[PDB]
Design an enzyme around this catalytic site. Structure first.
Site, PDB file in Angstrom:
ATOM      1  N   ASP A 186     -14.847  -8.849 -14.727  1.00  0.00           N
ATOM      2  CA  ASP A 186     -15.934  -9.122 -13.785  1.00  0.00           C
ATOM      3  C   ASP A 186     -15.495  -9.444 -12.337  1.00  0.00           C
ATOM      4  O   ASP A 186     -15.808 -10.518 -11.818  1.00  0.00           O
ATOM      5  CB  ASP A 186     -16.841 -10.233 -14.356  1.00  0.00           C
ATOM      6  CG  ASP A 186     -17.165 -10.025 -15.834  1.00  0.00           C
ATOM      7  OD1 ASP A 186     -17.505  -8.884 -16.213  1.00  0.00           O
ATOM      8  OD2 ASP A 186     -17.074 -10.994 -16.625  1.00  0.00           O
ATOM      9  N   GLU A 208     -27.204  -5.691 -16.060  1.00  0.00           N
ATOM     10  CA  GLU A 208     -26.597  -6.979 -15.718  1.00  0.00           C
ATOM     11  C   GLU A 208     -25.818  -6.855 -14.397  1.00  0.00           C
ATOM     12  O   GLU A 208     -26.001  -5.881 -13.648  1.00  0.00           O
ATOM     13  CB  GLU A 208     -25.699  -7.487 -16.872  1.00  0.00           C
ATOM     14  CG  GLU A 208     -24.611  -6.502 -17.337  1.00  0.00           C
ATOM     15  CD  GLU A 208     -23.948  -6.883 -18.662  1.00  0.00           C
ATOM     16  OE1 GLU A 208     -23.008  -6.174 -19.090  1.00  0.00           O
ATOM     17  OE2 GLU A 208     -24.339  -7.893 -19.276  1.00  0.00           O
TER      18      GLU A 208
END
Ligand code: CA
Ligand code: CA
Ligand code: CA
Lengths: 533, 533, 533
Positions: free
Chosen positions: A13, A185
């Protein structure tokens, strides 16, 4: 110039942030303490670890957190003279719910003492803070739908954050439902030209992963999707060594160029396996990579097609590389643990981990077992290469089978292997192997354990990792080594092997001490060696 | 004169303690907060709750604890003018390990401010403190063996406890391995006549449960086993309404009479089912019963065979009954919640649960889901009868499906059912059923949800439990009720239904509010009704 | 000109054969009897069933065969004045082994008495007979590797067959190992231009399915693979209504045109679901489709990219349409059962299924349960549409609960639903629902079964299938219908739902009678109706 991955081993991420001509990437850390790693670069090629912001219980209290709970994807930005870090503490990671809370911390500098958290919301993970041109601030995150007759990824929620009131204001609104890939997301907002661009991750963080981009003239939509979406994915490229490409963030450099950082997984070699049946096992977890962006008709494009390139051209700046920030052989003479070491869920104080009790040694007072989500005397570093050697020198005198100390290769509480010193009624102080696979434990040296001679002070413990397989070995003198007759498989320490699918970290190697009797027995570790081969 | 069980619903591992003509029983409470429930009696027939000793975070901090972790069997005793309470905080309840810590607290009185804990050991659960006739103190507990090739119940360990040093001193010693039933736990030492008697639990706390007694002239043994062991067991009595008889403690009354309190399970009616195939499902969990003792050749004998009798003869004293310590319809009038209500794992502050925000109402500010082992805005009481009605009246205005409030029947985080108020995109505020069975969620009324009109201030929620089945009903006005057309099965909220084995509690009924959005939305509960039928 | 699929419902592994301007497709039938369906066409568009070759127990004896065992992919060819049909009887369909035997049968005409089988080999399924231009004949099939650390699909074995000797001759040799797709399957050889072309199925018959083609100047290789391989696949086309595209066979038309027939699965609608997470559920099983080929540099190419087209241009011939070959409402006035009806595993004699016992009725004398792999009195036809009604009218008088008769929607012995008439001790003759999901049985009308009045001679039973869901209904008078208040889900009767992954058939609907008592009770079915929409 730049070969991917730029941050190797467990670095999911990536959130990139520009400040003038300095570049920063923050990655997720999950149950590993302290929370969040931040790396700095001048050239987007060479990266050094510069901050571990969430290091106070007041910021991050993860005791009891499930495996792959805790710090999910973070968001780092810079505005109004300070850095802003948004993070989650996820408490529930299986079933219909994903209970978790989003917080904001700030700091004037990247490596300072960050503020105590401002609570934002709990409506879903991947929170991100947008700083609009008019000064106003907006939080975006995914919105979680627990209902049985529903897809959990309800879209992207947006709400204005008031810096003055230190809270979200107005009413939250869904601004984007996603594409048919779903699992929408990782929202990020960018103001470019007359448009607000909304970047998302879609298709889930496994082999179907993608980065999606849309644009609108209104911050609230409707957002039109890139005509050639996904912006990035490895799904249609089963032979690409970089798989799982998605959860990206965009950087516009001071040199008027554009780049896209994203996570990727590098599967172990699969020769002789069906190409598509199972797309691989990634013991290094999800790593960070970078791609170049080009522009056409008001839309960004990954140079080299929508699949990730292994090698890219760096920005038009001078190369700035960094001195090695750890010793291959860490002899524990420092008054701090090297920053590549982490602990599980909580900080360990002097009563558990200490470099002070015995100079030149890291002392670990034995706590709970390797299956505990609470208090483990365990200090560990990431696997960052497919081929490496790791080694420790330890003195330990267990008086009961309830005590142990060893070298551990560790994924989570139910998935690990170790070469450890313990005690046996007949054979006294012994060496043994122990493995845990989905909570099922094996002792492969059963009834054939190595007897440690009464006159040996330090046992030497080694693991040699060779891509698909690894082996443990030992020495009683440091020069003559003996293999233990068990070949272990690296795929059993990978995201993909875990049956819960809450598997978001990667393999670590470290030093452990357990004392199940509670007599505070300890082990002294003279050095820890990690060397790529 | 005494009808069993003496303590109904979730009341396992009774530890009895005599102080003069006063009698106390301490029972285990696991994840339910505050820790330990102590009951007082004069006649051993009638029992009243008088203490909830572990009420401070400094004493018991169970956030994140697994279901059926926390406070296992406690041990209560009195010596040197004070009460001594020994307890565990068990962190790991599945797999090869059972990581857990043993602590001692004291109080001059049963219901005062108990001390902060003194750490004892961690070698195994079921700790018990013995006060020898010479003033020396000894701790006994089980000793845990985690090894693959080994039975986990290594036997009973003993070590001296130094009052002055506030720690165990000398070396720990195994004094007893148990009989061939194994699963040797629940050790309690008694100096009687001229022998040390060691009472243990064996066979496991399921249907093979037994109380084993042994004696020695030396504290460290070897111990000789009762010639007609087990002292107490339900295993050979499949038609007995009291199953799982074991984990006992012995009282010598002030009338020179002997009794044996023990846990027992009361299976639901299983008429027409094979007697020995599956011996039953107990939604009331493990309850407390009492047996009479008699002495024969230096050995105690349970009166009426070594099986539990349903009704015994009370001790030779005057009967003292107690006034009812809760209202059938608790209107939340006090400035404190009734002591039959407990919370999950942690105390709930006034930021989460308050009687001060709206007079005569319990206000619950919504927190995490029913699946969270962390922070739940949940206030609940034990099912204490096979046939009952429980009811609440609640004001709640959800703005999203992320918010709920309801009436919950609850075993653990993965096993529960609820009638709850939530919000639906089309229908607005709605009533719905939701169940969780080993983490798998069903919504029995999906598409059929009850629309709550805007003008309705209070929704009334009811459950009616009729032994093997129960049903929810609702009302908008308090007068006119409608049954929801779904019949639930009580066996799904039982010890015996949980596939983990770590199922040591019992069914609860209570009031929940969730706010998954993090907007601090709340539900106001006007009353909570519990009535035996 | 041609809309796909051309053969609708359960029609996998199409083997096309040209004889002049007559075209024939054979498909696999697995446990359904008789074995093999052959369809005929003049235009490749319109197809009618013309033969069911394996109708004698000497040819095909499938009693006890596991679900999705029996007749796998067949091969139909024509040479030297007769038809050649190669088939398998697969006995083992789960585990390391796939035990099965290959047979050749011949007939001068498509629909005559086929010969008794010539045994060929057992080295692995998908046998195919090649007729070389120089009058020699060779068999190819897949080679099965059972070894614990080996991919089971060893490749394609080739061996000469001798007509005179009724057996294979010379040495068996592997000619092809496959591509990285692996799971190499369904080989067919063709002599075109100067090359032999070997066609295979790779990637497995789920969503990774492909058709692979390779060439060589020698029959024995080495085969060089198509440069733009796969020839056909649905894998990179997740939005294509036609999925799982593979297991092809090639036809060269009398009009000098080229086409490729293949199997395909059409997932149920899945609006709102992640595109890639799970690619769908196919209750119509694997169907037969047709693609057009063109040639470019000595390699065939599917017209319209390498994914399957929904509509194609057929060959330059006059259209020949066929008369409907079954009655919408089959009143059972005929001498023999309509050829769209099949039985499980074995032929049913007049002692079990007969149109003669009761004029205008099909009578089934009850035998074993729906879970029996042996003798079921069950007569069924394929679901062939996403939207249809099926209906029957039955006379039945059960005297025990061991007796049932009804309308069944059936996948395999472990997966089915039914509306059925049975007997209850207190209610008497009843109508009930029953479902079986992986052997787990439910009676969703338990306690509320429909009482059939004693004066009612015929009960009318209906199923209405509407894509993702279906509902049963009933009537006593055939004019007024009542829905049973249960909504069933079509995906539970689909290939993809089946846990064993030996799931190669498709949903059927039919008439059943069980007599578990052995009193030879029977049910008289007045009609059977199947109607699209
Ligand atoms: Ca050192
Ligand atoms: Ca009130
Ligand atoms: Ca008829």
């Amino acid at each position: 110039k730049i070969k991917n991955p730029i941050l190797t081993g467990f670095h999911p991420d990536p959130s990139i942030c520009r400040v003038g001509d300095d570049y920063y990437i923050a990655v997720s850390t999950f149950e590993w303490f302290p929370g969040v790693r931040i790396y700095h670069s001048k050239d987007l090629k060479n990266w050094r670890l510069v901050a571990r912001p969430l290091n106070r219980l007041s910021q991050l209290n993860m005791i009891g957190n499930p495996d792959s709970g805790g710090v999910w994807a973070p968001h780092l930005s810079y505005s109004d003279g300070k850095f802003w870090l948004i993070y989650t503490d996820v408490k529930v990671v299986e079933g219909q719910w994903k209970d978790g809370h989003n917080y904001l911390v700030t700091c004037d500098t990247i490596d300072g003492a960050w503020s105590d958290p401002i609570y934002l919301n709990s409506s879903g993970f991947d929170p991100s803070l947008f700083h609009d041109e008019d000064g106003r601030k907006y939080l975006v995150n995914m919105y979680w739908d627990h209902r049985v007759d529903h897809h959990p990824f309800y879209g992207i929620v947006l709400q204005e954050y008031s810096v003055e009131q230190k809270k979200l204001v107005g009413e939250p609104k869904i601004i984007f439902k996603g594409t048919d890939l779903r699992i929408t997301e990782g929202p990020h907002l960018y103001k470019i030209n007359g448009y607000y661009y909304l970047l998302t991750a879609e298709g889930g963080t496994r082999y179907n992963h993608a980065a999606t981009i849309a644009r609108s003239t209104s911050l609230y939509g409707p957002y039109e999707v890139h005509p050639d979406n996904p912006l990035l994915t490895s799904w249609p490229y089963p032979r690409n060594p970089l798989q799982k490409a998605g959860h990206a963030s965009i950087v516009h450099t001071h040199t008027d160029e554009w780049f896209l950082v994203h996570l990727t997984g590098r599967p172990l070699p699969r020769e002789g396996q069906p190409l598509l049946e199972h797309r691989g096992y990634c013991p290094l977890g999800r790593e960070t990579a970078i791609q170049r962006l080009e522009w056409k008709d008001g839309w960004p494009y990954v140079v080299g097609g929508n699949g990730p390139s292994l090698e890219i051209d760096g920005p038009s700046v001078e190369e700035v590389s960094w001195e090695k920030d750890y010793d291959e052989k860490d002899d524990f003479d420092g008054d701090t643990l090297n920053h590549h070491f982490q602990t599980l869920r909580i900080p360990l104080g002097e009563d558990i981990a200490t470099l002070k009790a015995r100079p030149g040694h890291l002392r670990l007072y034995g706590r709970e077992s390797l299956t505990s989500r609470f208090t483990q005397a365990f200090v560990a570093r990431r696997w960052q290469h497919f081929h490496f050697v790791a080694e420790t020198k330890v003195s330990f005198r267990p008086t009961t089978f309830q005590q142990s100390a060893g070298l551990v290769n560790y994924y989570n509480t139910q998935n690990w292997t170790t070469l450890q010193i313990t005690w046996h009624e007949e054979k006294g102080r012994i060496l043994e192997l122990m493995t845990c696979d989905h909570l099922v434990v094996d002792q492969p040296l059963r009834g054939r354990e190595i007897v440690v001679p009464d006159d040996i002070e330090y046992v030497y413990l080694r693991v040699t990792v060779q891509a698909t397989t690894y082996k443990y070995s030992y020495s009683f003198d440091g020069m003559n080594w003996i293999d233990l007759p068990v070949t272990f498989e690296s795929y059993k320490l990978s995201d993909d092997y875990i049956k819960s699918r809450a598997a978001f970290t990667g393999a670590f190697v470290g030093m452990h001490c357990r004392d199940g009797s509670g007599q505070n027995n300890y082990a002294d570790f003279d050095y820890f060696l990690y060397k790529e081969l």
